[PDB]
Amino acid sequence: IEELKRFLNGQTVVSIQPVTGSPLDKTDFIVAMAIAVEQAGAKALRIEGVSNVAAVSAAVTIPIIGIVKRDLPDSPVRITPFVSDVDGLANAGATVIAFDATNRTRPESRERIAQAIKNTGCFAMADCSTFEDGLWANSQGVEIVGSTLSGYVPTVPDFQLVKAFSEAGFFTMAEGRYNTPELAAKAIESGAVAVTVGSALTRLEVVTQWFNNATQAAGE
Amino acid sequence: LNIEELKRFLNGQTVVSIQPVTGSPLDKTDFIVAMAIAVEQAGAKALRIEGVSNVAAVSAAVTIPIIGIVKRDLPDSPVRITPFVSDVDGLANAGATVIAFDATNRTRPESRERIAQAIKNTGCFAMADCSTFEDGLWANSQGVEIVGSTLSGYVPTVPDFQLVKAFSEAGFFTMAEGRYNTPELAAKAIESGAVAVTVGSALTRLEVVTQWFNNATQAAGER
Ligand SMILES: CC(=O)N[C@H](C=O)[C@@H](O)[C@H](O)[C@H](O)COP(=O)(O)O
Ligand SMILES: CC(=O)N[C@H](C=O)[C@@H](O)[C@H](O)[C@H](O)COP(=O)(O)O
Q: Is B198 in the pocket of ligand 2 (CB under 6 A)?
A: yes
The nearest alpha carbon in chain A to B208 belongs to A40
Portion 19-78 of B in contact with A at CB < 8 A: 24-26, 28, 30-31, 34-35, 37-39, 41-44
Q: How many residues does chain B have?
A: 223
Pairing of strands A45-48, B173-177: unpaired
Pairing of strands B173-177, B146-148: parallel
| Calpha distance A64→A67 (Å, rounded) | 9
Cβ count within 10 A of residue B217: 27
Contact B216 A24 (CB under 8 A): no
DSSP lists the bridge partners of residue B66 as B47
| Calpha distance A173→A190 (Å, rounded) | 11
Nearest residue to B95 (alpha-carbon basis) of B144, B126, B130, B58: B58
Nearest residue to B63 (alpha-carbon basis) of B80, B30, B39: B39
| Calpha distance B203→B15 (Å, rounded) | 11
The nearest alpha carbon in chain B to A39 belongs to B207
Q: How was this structure determined?
A: X-ray
Nearest residue to A163 (alpha-carbon basis) of A137, A141, A134: A134
Q: Is B201 in the pocket of ligand 2 (CB under 6 A)?
A: yes
Half-sphere exposure of B204 (CA within 13 A, CB side): 26
Q: Which domains does chain A have, with CATH numbers?
A: 1-220 (3.20.20.70)
Question: What is the number of H-type helices and E-type strands within chain B?
Answer: 10, 8
| Calpha distance B66→A11 (Å, rounded) | 37
Nearest residue to A208 (alpha-carbon basis) of B13, B176, B158, B65: B13
Q: How far is the CA of B16 from the centre of ligand 2 (A)?
A: 11
Q: Is A106 helix (H, G, I), strand (E, B) or coil?
A: coil
Contact A208 B26 (CB under 8 A): no
Among the bound ligands, name the one nearest to the CA of residue B157: 2
Name the region of B163 (left: φ>0; alpha: ψ -120 to 50; beta: rest): alpha
| Calpha distance B84→A200 (Å, rounded) | 37
| Calpha distance A187→B216 (Å, rounded) | 10
Dihedral sign for Cα atoms in the order B127, B41, A184, A7 = negative
Q: How many residues does chain A have?
A: 220
Nearest residue to B179 (alpha-carbon basis) of B190, B189, B194: B189
Q: How far is the CA of A115 from the centre of ligand 2 (A)?
A: 50
| Calpha distance B116→B93 (Å, rounded) | 16
The nearest alpha carbon in chain A to B222 belongs to A10
Q: Is the separation of the CB atoms in A132 and A153 below 8 Å?
A: no
| HEC assignment per residue over B146-199 | EEECCCCCCCCCCCCHHHHHHHHHCCCEEEEECCCCCHHHHHHHHHCCCCEEEE
| Calpha distance B199→A79 (Å, rounded) | 33
Who's near A188: CB < 8 A, 6+ residues apart?
A: A10, A174, A194, A195, B217, B220, B221
| Calpha distance A194→A33 (Å, rounded) | 20
Portion 157-196 of B in contact with A at CB < 8 A: 182-184, 186-187, 189-191, 196
Query: CB-based burial of residue B76 (10 Å sphere; 0-12 exposed, 13-18 middle, 19+ buried)?
Result: exposed
**Residue A8 gets which letter from DSSP?**
S
- Chain A residue numbers with beta carbons less than 8 Å from the beta carbon of B217 are 10-12, 181, 184-185, 187-188, 194-195
Kindly report the backbone phi and psi dihedral angles of residue B199, in degrees, each rounded to the nearest multiple of 5, phi listed first: -130, 125
| Calpha distance A117→A91 (Å, rounded) | 11
Torsion over CA of A117, A120, A125 and A126, rounded to 10 degrees? 0
The nearest alpha carbon in chain A to B182 belongs to A211
Q: Is the separation of the CB atoms in A199 and A210 below 8 Å?
A: no
Contact A39 B31 (CB under 8 A): no
Among the bound ligands, name the one nearest to the CA of residue A71: 1
Contact A215 B223 (CB under 8 A): no
What is the secondary structure of B84-130 as a DSSP string?
SHHHHHHHHHHT-SEEEEE---S--SS-HHHHHHHHHHHTSEEEEE-
| Calpha distance A128→A115 (Å, rounded) | 17
Element of type H or E holding B23: none
Nearest residue to A118 (alpha-carbon basis) of A158, A87, A150, A147: A87
Nearest residue to A120 (alpha-carbon basis) of A148, A81, A102, A93: A93
Alpha-carbon distances, residue A57 vs A66, A192, B40 (angstroms) = 10, 25, 31
> Which candidate from A181, A214, A216 shows the least CB-CB separation from B213?
A181
Nearest residue to B135 (alpha-carbon basis) of B160, B114, B95, B163: B163
Who's near A120: CB < 8 A, 6+ residues apart?
A: A86, A87, A90, A97
**Residue A196 gets which letter from DSSP?**
E
Q: Is B71 helix (H, G, I), strand (E, B) or coil?
A: strand
Kindly report the backbone phi and psi dihedral angles of residue B115, in degrees, each rounded to the nearest multiple of 5, phi listed first: -60, -50
Q: What is the resolution of this structure in A?
A: 2.7
| Calpha distance A197→A151 (Å, rounded) | 16
- Chain A residue numbers with beta carbons less than 8 Å from the beta carbon of B46 are none
| Calpha distance A87→B39 (Å, rounded) | 36
Contact B217 A187 (CB under 8 A): yes
Element of type H or E holding A104: none
What is the secondary structure of A42-99 as a DSSP string?
---EEEESHHHHHHHHTT--S-EEEE-B---SS-S--BS-SHHHHHHHHHHT-SEEEE
Q: Is B102 in the pocket of ligand 2 (CB under 6 A)?
A: no
